[PDB]
Amino acid sequence: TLTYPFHDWSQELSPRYAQLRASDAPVCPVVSEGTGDPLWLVTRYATAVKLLEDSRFSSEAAQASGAPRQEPVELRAPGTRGDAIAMLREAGLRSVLADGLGPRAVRRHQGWINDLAETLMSELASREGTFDLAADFVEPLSSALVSRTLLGELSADERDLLAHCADTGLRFCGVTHEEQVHAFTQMHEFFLEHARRLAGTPGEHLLKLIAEAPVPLSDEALAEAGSLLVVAGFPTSSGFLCGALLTLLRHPDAVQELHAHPERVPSAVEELLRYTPLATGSAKRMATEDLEIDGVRIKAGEVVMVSLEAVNHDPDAFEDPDVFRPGREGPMHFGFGRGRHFCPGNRLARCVIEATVRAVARRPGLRLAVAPEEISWHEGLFFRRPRAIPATW
Numbered sequence: 200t201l202t203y204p205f206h207d208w209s210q211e212l213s214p215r216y217a218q219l220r221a222s223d224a225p226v227c228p229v230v231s232e233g234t235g236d237p238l239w240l241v242t243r244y245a246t247a248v249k250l251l252e253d254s255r256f257s258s259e260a261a262q263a264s265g266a267p268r269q270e271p272v273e274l275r276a277p278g279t280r281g282d283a284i285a286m287l288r289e290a291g292l293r294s295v296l297a298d299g300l301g302p303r304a305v306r307r308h309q310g311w312i313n314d315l316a317e318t319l320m321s322e323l324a325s326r327e328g329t330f331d332l333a334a335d336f337v338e339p340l341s342s343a344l345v346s347r348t349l350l351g352e353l354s355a356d357e358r359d360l361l362a363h364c365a366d367t368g369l370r371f372c373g374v375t376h377e378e379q380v381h382a383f384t385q386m387h388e389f390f391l392e393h394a395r396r397l398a399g400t401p402g403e404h405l406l407k408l409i410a411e412a413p414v415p416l417s418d419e420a421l422a423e424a425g426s427l428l429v430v431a432g433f434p435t436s437s438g439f440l441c442g443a444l445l446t447l448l449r450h451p452d453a454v455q456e457l458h459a460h461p462e463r464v465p466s467a468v469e470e471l472l473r474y475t476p477l478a479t480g481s482a483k484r485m486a487t488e489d490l491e492i493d494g495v496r497i498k499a500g501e502v503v504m505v506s507l508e509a510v511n512h513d514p515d516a517f518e519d520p521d522v523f524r525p526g527r528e529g530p531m532h533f534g535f536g537r538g539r540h541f542c543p544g545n546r547l548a549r550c551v552i553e554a555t556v557r558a559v560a561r562r563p564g565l566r567l568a569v570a571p572e573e574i575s576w577h578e579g580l581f582f583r584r585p586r587a588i589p590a591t592w
């Protein structure tokens with residue numbers, strides 16, 4: 200009877216997640232508000248490990264057109280596959296994905312990412328008055344990450360178009376179904392027209408590595424790779440960096456510790472990934488056969504969701520789970536997932552989060568110019584994001 204998701208669009212997690220977690224079942228039935236599909240929902244760390252490390256629960260099967268699902272419209276342009284990352288690994292591009300997303304990419308890019316973070320923060324510090332950390336720090340930094348490491352250099356109008364498509368398509372509510380579908384169409388048509396151009400510009404952005412890779416990727420396939428990098432890399436990084444700055448600004452003692460002890464910043468990055476919520480939906484997998492999870496039978500074809508926010512706030516895994524405690528020394532967080540589908544963007548994500556944390560830690564006194572309650576949130580996004588983050592020294 201419980202409908203999903205829980206409309207917890209700000210950083211305050213829905214109390215439903217703790218209620219289910221403490222329930223007597225390790226897996227609980229819900230219904231998709233957007234489709235009426237019955238779904239299963241996992242909220243406990245121990246059960247989540249088991250689900251996401253069992254390859255008979257398939258991610259691709261849960262993404263496929265026609266699967267039971269939490270999202271109101273399919274997350275693809277009509278007529279296209281929608282499984283880009285599978286398709287690129289499919290065509291033998293694991294090596295390419297590693298060179299473009301792995302440690303060597305971070306080594307190529309970490310210099311300018313930290314230069315840009317400081318330059319942005321320095322300019323804001325030079326301002327008389329308040330400023331907006333979302334529009335004035337996160338947007339330029341996340342846009343530069345997308346252009347330089349993922350797609351190739353975008354104009355401001357192209358960045359805005361891709362951001363709008365992602366915000367419109369990656370939603371539970373607040374737009375009509377047809378608008379959502381059309382956002383995916385527009386984004387596909389943008390890369391049908393522009394992916395080869397972007398791939399051909401100088402740089403080592405991933406889309407170039409993909410387009411130049413031996414396998415002849417079609418325009419449609421290269422367009423799907425472009426769309427994947429937007430949906431997976433852009434609203435995620437923007438939303439998270441926004442949420443992480445909010446967390447830091449609400450924990451000046453933690454920031455002061457990092458200012459005095461910069462060697463502690465990596466531990467703080469990992470705690471932000473646990474503590475700061477991002478997705479308002481759930482990672483999900485389809486039972487490819489009849490399966491059982493901690494005693495509950497899951498029939499073939501049924502989809503099991505795991506809320507990574509719920510798992511990350513599981514008190515059986517993390518003591519005082521709702522406390523931001525850098526260095527807490529508990530189990531691995533789920534902010535990048537678990538198992539085979541662990542976020543491949545995790546190296547670049549950690550790079551940009553770390554650069555942001557260090558930029559903040561170097562400048563104590565940075566604070567919200569309004570109360571946390573006065574922050575306004577985009578309602579219905581998959582990936583939480585505030586409308587603005589008024590801030591000042």
Ligand code: HEM
Nearest residue numbers: 284431432435436439482483534535536540542543544548
């Ligand atoms: C910056 C913050 C980011 C966060 C918090 C994050 C988080 C995640 C998580 C939790 C998943 C797993 C979803 C699942 O289990 O089904 C995932 C998957 C993925 N991420 Fe990230 N991500 C971020 C950034 C990025 C970036 C920058 C890229 C690439 C440029 C990226 C590329 C991907 C891809 C392609 C997948 C799909 C993996 C698969 O389904 O096999 N992510 N991400």
Ligand SMILES: O=C1N[C@@H](Cc2c[nH]c3ccccc23)C(=O)N2CCC[C@@H]12
Nearest residue numbers: 258262274281283284369427430431581
């Ligand atoms: O590569 C994928 N993986 C999963 C999880 C995911 C990772 N990043 C996402 C961004 C938005 C929605 C889902 C995800 C998925 O649902 N996918 C549909 C869009 C991208 C595709």
Ligand SMILES: O=C1N[C@@H](Cc2c[nH]c3ccccc23)C(=O)N2CCC[C@@H]12
Nearest residue numbers: 270435477478479480481482483507581
């Ligand atoms: O809210 C969602 N989360 C991702 C998984 C994910 C969980 N946490 C993430 C963080 C970054 C990227 C993806 C994820 C997913 O598969 N979805 C299908 C529709 C809703 C959407």
Ligand code: NA
Nearest residue numbers: 253254539540
């Ligand atoms: Na798997």
